[PDB]
UniProtKB/Swiss-Prot annotation:
UniProt record similarity statement: Belongs to the bacterial ribosomal protein bL9 family.
Location of this fragment in the whole protein: 1 to 73 of 148
Organism in which the protein naturally occurs: Thermus thermophilus (strain ATCC BAA-163 / DSM 7039 / HB27)
Biological function: Binds to the 23S rRNA.
Gene symbol of the encoding locus: rplI
Protein's name according to its UniProt entry: Large ribosomal subunit protein bL9
Length: 73
RNA sequence: CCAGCCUAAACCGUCCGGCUUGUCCGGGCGGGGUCGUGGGGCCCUCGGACACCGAAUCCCCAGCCUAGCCGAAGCUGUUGGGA
C-alpha cells in the first residue's frame, strides 16, 4: 500500500515521503502507531498543499529579502 | 396495457470540527447535472419573457358502494276441504 510517513523512518525514509510497503506492516504498525497515514487520493491532495504552501511561503520570504538586497547594498 | 422519472460525480455557495491555519481535508444542507443520433461541468457568440409540455402530488365536482322508494291489468259461474 501507498502511505505517507510523517516521521523520520529508518528503512523507509524521511518525513513527507511516499513509499509503498506491505499492507500488514502499515495496517498493523505504521498506521496504528501514528507513524504514517494511508496515502488516499484525499491525503495526496492535502500534501500538495503542504508542499505548495511552504514553497511560495519561503519563495516569497526570499522574494521580499530581494528588495532589501537591492537597496541595503 | 401503455409512461416514464429521480439521483452520484465535475462545478459554485454555506454552516459545523479536525488539524501540521491552508486557494485544504472531510461531514451535513442548497444550486447545478442525468445522457448514447454520447451527455454533463467550467469559459465564449446568441432572442426569449408574457411561448409552450405538465403530473403518478394536492383541491372541487360527476359518477359509484354502504338504507330505500314508484311500479300496468279481473270479475262471475263451476267440481272441490281448498281454485
Ligand atoms: Mg470527497
Ligand atoms: Mg475535494
Ligand atoms: Mg441534490
Ligand atoms: Mg464533493
Ligand atoms: Mg467533500
Ligand atoms: Mg461542502
Ligand atoms: Mg461526499
Ligand atoms: Mg448526500
Ligand atoms: Mg437538485
Ligand atoms: Mg447550467
Ligand atoms: Mg434538477
Ligand atoms: Mg440543462
Ligand atoms: Mg439511464
Ligand atoms: Mg462534452
Ligand atoms: Mg395542466
Ligand atoms: Mg373529498
Ligand atoms: Mg351525487
Ligand atoms: Mg266469486
Ligand atoms: Mg274463482
Amino acid at each position: 500500500m501507498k502511505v505517507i510517513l510523517l516521521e523520520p523512518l529508518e528503512n523507509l525514509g524521511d518525513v513527507g515521503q511516499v513509499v509503498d510497503v506491505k499492507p500488514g506492516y502499515a495496517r498493523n504498525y505504521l498506521l496504528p502507531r501514528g507513524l504514517a497515514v494511508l496515502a488516499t487520493e484525499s491525503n495526496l491532495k492535502a500534501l500538495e498543499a503542504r508542499i505548495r504552501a511552504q514553497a511560495k511561503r519561503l519563495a516569497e520570504r526570499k522574494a521580499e529579502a530581494e528588495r532589501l538586497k537591492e537597496i541595503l547594498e
